[PDB]
Amino acid sequence: KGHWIPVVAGFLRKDGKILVGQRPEGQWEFPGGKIENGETPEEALARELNEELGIEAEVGELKLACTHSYGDVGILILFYEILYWKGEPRAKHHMMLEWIHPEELKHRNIPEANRKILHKIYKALGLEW
Amino acid sequence: KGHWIPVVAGFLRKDGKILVGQRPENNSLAGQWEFPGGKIENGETPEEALARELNEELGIEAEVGELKLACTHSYGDVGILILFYEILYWKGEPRAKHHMMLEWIHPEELKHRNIPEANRKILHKIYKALGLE
Ligand SMILES: [Cl-]
Ligand SMILES: [Ho]
Ligand SMILES: [Ho]
Numbered sequence: 001k002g003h004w005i006p007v008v009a010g011f012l013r014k015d016g017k018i019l020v021g022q023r024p025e026g027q028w029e030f031p032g033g034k035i036e037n038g039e040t041p042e043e044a045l046a047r048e049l050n051e052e053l054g055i056e057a058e059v060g061e062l063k064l065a066c067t068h069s070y071g072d073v074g075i076l077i078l079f080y081e082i083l084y085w086k087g088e089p090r091a092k093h094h095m096m097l098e099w100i101h102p103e104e105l106k107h108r109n110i111p112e113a114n115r116k117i118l119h120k121i122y123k124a125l126g127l128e129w
Numbered sequence: 130k131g132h133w134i135p136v137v138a139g140f141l142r143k144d145g146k147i148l149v150g151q152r153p154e155n156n157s158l159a160g161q162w163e164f165p166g167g168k169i170e171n172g173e174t175p176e177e178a179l180a181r182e183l184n185e186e187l188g189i190e191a192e193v194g195e196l197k198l199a200c201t202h203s204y205g206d207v208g209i210l211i212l213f214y215e216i217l218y219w220k221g222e223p224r225a226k227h228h229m230m231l232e233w234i235h236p237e238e239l240k241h242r243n244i245p246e247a248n249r250k251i252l253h254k255i256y257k258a259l260g261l262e
Contacts, residue, residue, distance in 0.1 A: 001171055004133045006201075006210045037131050037208045041199045065175050065196055065212055067135075074171055076135050076210065078199050 004074040006035040008045040010082045011063065011125065012089070018102050018125070020110075021052065021094035028098070028108045030079070031089075041078050049082070052093040057085040063124040068113035075113065079124060102127055131206030137179040138166035139216040140197065140259065141223070143233045147259070149242070150186065150228030162232075162242045164213070165223075175212050183216070186227040191219035198258040202247045209247070213258060236261055 009032035012019035020028045033048035035041055042059040049057040060081040068075045091097045100108070102125055105118060114121070122129040141148040150165050152158040167182035169175055176193040183191045194215040202209035225231045234242065236259050240252055248255075256262045 002134075002168075004135050004169075004210075006133050006135065006208075035133075035201060035208070035210070037133075037203050037206065038201075040201055041210075062196055062199055065199065067169065067174055069172060074135075074169075076133075076169070076175075 001072075002074075003072065004076055006041075006076045006078070008032045008035060008041050008048065008078050008080065010045055010049055010057065010059075010080055012049075012057075012082045012085070013125075014099065016101065017099040018105075019089060020098050020100055020105075020108070021091070022096040022098070024093075024095060026095060026109075028110050029114070031094075042080070045080055049085070053087075053089040053097070054092055055085040055087040055089055057082050060084070064117075064120055066113070066117045066120065068116070077113070079121070131208060133208045133210055135169040135175070136166060136209055136211045137169060137175050137182065138164040138211055138213050139179055139183055139191065139193070140164065140213060141191075141216045141219070145235065146233035147236045147239075148223060148231060148233055149239075150225070151230045151232075153227065153229050158245050160229075160243060161245050163245060163248065165228075166211075176214070179214055179216075183219070187221075187223040187231075188226050189219045189221040189223055191216050194218070198254055200251045200254060202251075204247075211251075213255070 009030040031052050035044040064079040066077050149162040165186050169178040179193045194217045198213040200211045
């Protein structure tokens with residue numbers, strides 16, 4: 001077997017908080033989405049943040065990559081830091097957007113793929129857990 | 130959409146130089162120089178894939194350090210996603226188990242080497258991740 005879906009996700013950081021979106025009916029995920037053939041990962045992410053949030057984001061440092069399996073398919077998530085953007089994030093894809101202290105992730109319903117690597121996420125934000 | 134193939138590659142350094150390997154004689158990229166690494170297998174993390182690949186290609190036991198860069202290649206309807214990791218620490222000295230030949234080069238000389246067409250197009254990003262230019 002050998003099937004894979006590459007995904008980009010943004011860590012939008014502001015005032016010590018991180019932006020998280022509630023999946024449509026709800027788990028809380030980092031905004032972003034799938035990489036389309038022909039796009040760089042940074043292009044994909046700028047596009048998805050524009051599509052989901054309506055912002056024009058500067059894609060910053062590549063922080064982390066993780067793999068997870070959904071049985072028949074492999075998922076590869078690339079996590080990029082976003083420190084600068086134009087526009088305000090609006091919930092045009094998610095039922096709810098929320099700024100949270102990274103600490104809250106420990107007690108929010110996030111995808112099990114994100115929960116299993118939460119230690120890596122905090123390290124990737126330069127935080128201790 | 131098409132299909133995606135995730136790939137890992139490692140930056141190993143020697144007194145400023147960087148390790149490249151020349152693809153073997155009946156290879157799809159026979160004669161061309163690349164960073165060591167290979168495909169991620171199902172179930173494994175990119176770091177697990179890279180440590181395995183480095184042992185199988187170089188005969189070394191390496192620790193996988195910081196993720197430095199991710200790049201995409203398109204070959205028609207197939208996409209390649211390459212993750213480049215810094216490799217600071219390993220046991221042993223790389224030997225040509227897979228490649229025709231190994232060489233430690235000055236990273237700035239990468240552009241003058243016979244490198245894969247796809248690798249050339251991402252060279253500016255590789256320089257930036259290596260701390261050059
Ligand atoms: Cl997510
Ligand atoms: Ho999207
Ligand atoms: Ho390999």
